[PDB]
């Protein structure tokens, strides 16, 4: 299936406070009214320039992503996981199952079978959006958690995404995947292009509205 975003995937281009100021930016955005894939429950996707990624549930079936160029050994990759404990970022050379996942006893993690040469570690319904990008050896992640009053369909509205993380890795990326918690006892993928937007800033400094300046003559 395919679906239509309406006004989705707007993130704060950077720090620096700001108030009521229709500020104009050039960056990598998800164009308004786009053609976003639909997935149910998954396969190896491309990256090619950033990614929008939403998801909907009350349980937690979406348990992180895996990134990289080959998703195996012989080249390095990232791995972002969340068991019922908390997030586990990790950067080694792995050996990934071609269909990697984790179970739910509640024993799991048939994800990889190798953790060599680790160069970075870290340990510690609902709509959960994420924007992933990778520039100059930094892997930036923006995110937002809005509550839907549906269960698993893409809604309409405006909600800007706030920066979360910054990782000075150096890693090359060309592909990525997803991770799901099996049954033993809905998600979308947009892509980002270089656009020019007009963001409206509130008096507290939040982005409340935007204009995509390449949609139509009025814009």
């Amino acid at each position: 299936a395919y679906t239509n975003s309406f006004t989705r995937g707007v993130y704060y281009p950077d720090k620096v406070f700001r108030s009521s100021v229709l500020h104009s930016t050039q960056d990598l955005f998800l164009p308004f009214f786009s053609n976003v894939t639909w997935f149910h429950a998954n396969p190896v996707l491309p990256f090619n320039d950033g990614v929008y990624f939403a998801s909907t549930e009350k349980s937690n079936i979406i348990r992180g992503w895996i990134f990289g160029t080959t998703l195996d050994s012989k080249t390095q990759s990232l791995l972002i996981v969340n068991n019922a404990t908390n997030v586990v970022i990790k950067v080694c050379e792995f050996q990934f199952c071609n269909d990697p996942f984790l179970g739910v006893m509640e024993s799991e993690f048939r994800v990889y079978s190798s953790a060599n040469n680790c160069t970075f570690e870290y340990v510690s319904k609902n709509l959960r959006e994420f924007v992933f990008k990778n520039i100059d050896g930094y892997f930036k992640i923006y995110s937002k958690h809005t509550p839907i009053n549906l269960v698993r369909d893409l809604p309409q509205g405006f909600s800007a995404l706030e920066p979360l993380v910054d990782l000075p890795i150096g890693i090359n990326i060309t592909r990525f995947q997803t991770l799901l918690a099996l049954h033993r006892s809905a998600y979308y993928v947009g892509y980002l292009q270089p656009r020019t937007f007009l963001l409206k800033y509130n008096e507290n400094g939040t982005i409340t509205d935007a204009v995509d300046c390449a949609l139509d003559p009025l814009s």
Partner: protein, 413 residues
């Protein structure tokens, strides 16, 4: 200063812009992030048991806050040589990776841990490339590693086929073969076990006592960044033109307590026309406004040098409280050297916002100009005034019609 600005010895009455007033700030208050991950070297420089010389260790220090000053000044090190880079400038640079290698050698073998040496250690135990970049640190450890009778747990390799490549490592234990006769895994003449052991004692002269060595090697692949020195700071002030640096933001101005609320990931705020006007303190996390420091123009009011040499001074829009008698505050700035009177005359020298100056009462005075006399027409619903005489008057009016015709020759100019 007016005579110099005009390039003359006689100034005619007027008002002249002569220079500028710019408050001056002092001290360079620094700011940064609370001293967090400062790298815990106290594991490689504070281990209970080091590593052999033939199988050295290799720790890959990574993204952190490294403070090579606690090393450099610890005075506990018997040898601290830096090769690619002199030691004091380490806490001011950033690399991609730092590696730390650790081992234990004799006392007089510390001179083979250097780029371009030879000997049983540098040949085949641990070889440093010829364009090394890091630093080599070494200190005596007789009391920890030497025991009564002989500590035979510290070995080294004394036979190898070929010298090591730089940073290459070889933990094999094959029987060496000196002569041409094959060895078949048994000892004998010209078939030697390749590892020997320092028998360290407690009564051995210096140069035979064990020294512990750590070799830091800074490398710079081609990433985006990594660990580096720790920046310094101070205690920001307020209500004083200052020269500030907020973890990268360099500027000048007065700092003041704010009442805006950033979002909890935004560092500084900008205005329309894009100038930094607020910051957040990295240590205490409070918002501070940065208003441009005092400044404006200075004007000199003179009655003309053919009348007097007294002068008054206008400090364009600036509260008469931070200028450095008659100090008088105007909507146009602070006036010094003229007295304010209560009369009102016709305007002479225009100051602004209704205020003029004159050389009358002498000296220089201030006041509010006069629009004109005051005539009161005796108007009524049945009264008229009619003239009984006249005057013939004649006045002049002067108008420019032309200016001078000039030509230039581009090429000759």
């Amino acid at each position: 200063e007016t005579k110099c600005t005009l390039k003359s010895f006689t100034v005619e009455k007027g008002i002249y812009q002569t220079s500028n007033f710019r408050v001056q700030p002092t001290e360079s208050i620094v700011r940064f992030p609370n001293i967090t991950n400062l790298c815990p070297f106290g594991e490689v420089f504070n281990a209970t048991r080091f590593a052999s010389v033939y199988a050295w260790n290799r720790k890959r220090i990574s993204n952190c806050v490294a403070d090579y000053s606690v090393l450099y000044n610890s005075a506990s090190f018997s040898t601290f040589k830096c090769y690619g880079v002199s030691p004091t400038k380490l806490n001011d640079l950033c690399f991609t990776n730092v590696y730390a290698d650790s081992f234990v050698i004799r006392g007089d073998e510390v001179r083979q841990i250097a780029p371009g040496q030879t000997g049983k250690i540098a040949d085949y135990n641990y070889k440093l490339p010829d364009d090394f970049t890091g630093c080599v640190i070494a200190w005596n450890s007789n009391n920890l590693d030497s025991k009564v009778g002989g500590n035979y747990n510290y070995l080294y390799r004394l036979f190898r086929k070929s010298n090591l490549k730089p940073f290459e490592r070889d933990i094999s234990t094959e029987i060496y073969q000196a002569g041409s006769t094959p060895c078949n895994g048994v000892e004998g003449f010209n078939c030697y076990f390749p590892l020997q052991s320092y028998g360290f004692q407690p009564t051995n002269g210096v140069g035979y006592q064990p020294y512990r060595v750590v070799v830091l090697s800074f490398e710079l692949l081609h990433a985006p960044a990594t660990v580096c020195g720790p920046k310094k700071s101070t205690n920001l002030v307020k209500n004083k033109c200052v020269n500030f640096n907020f973890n990268g933001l360099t500027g000048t101005g007065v700092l003041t307590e704010s009442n805006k609320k950033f979002l909890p990931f935004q560092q500084f705020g900008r205005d329309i026309a894009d100038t930094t006007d607020a910051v957040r303190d990295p240590q205490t996390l409070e918002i501070l406004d940065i208003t441009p420091c005092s400044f404006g123009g200075v004007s000199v009011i003179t009655p003309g040098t053919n009348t007097s040499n007294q002068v008054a001074v206008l400090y364009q829009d600036v509260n008469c409280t931070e200028v450095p008698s008659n100090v008088f505050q105007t909507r146009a700035g602070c006036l010094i050297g003229a007295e304010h009177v209560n009369n009102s005359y016709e305007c002479d020298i225009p100051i602004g916002a209704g205020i003029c100056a004159s050389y009358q009462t002498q000296s220089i005075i201030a006041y509010t100009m006069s629009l004109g006399a005051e005539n009161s027409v005796a108007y009524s619903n049945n009264s008229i005034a009619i003239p009984t005489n006249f005057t013939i008057s004649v006045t002049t009016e002067i108008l420019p019609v032309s200016m001078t015709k000039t030509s230039v020759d581009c090429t000759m100019y």
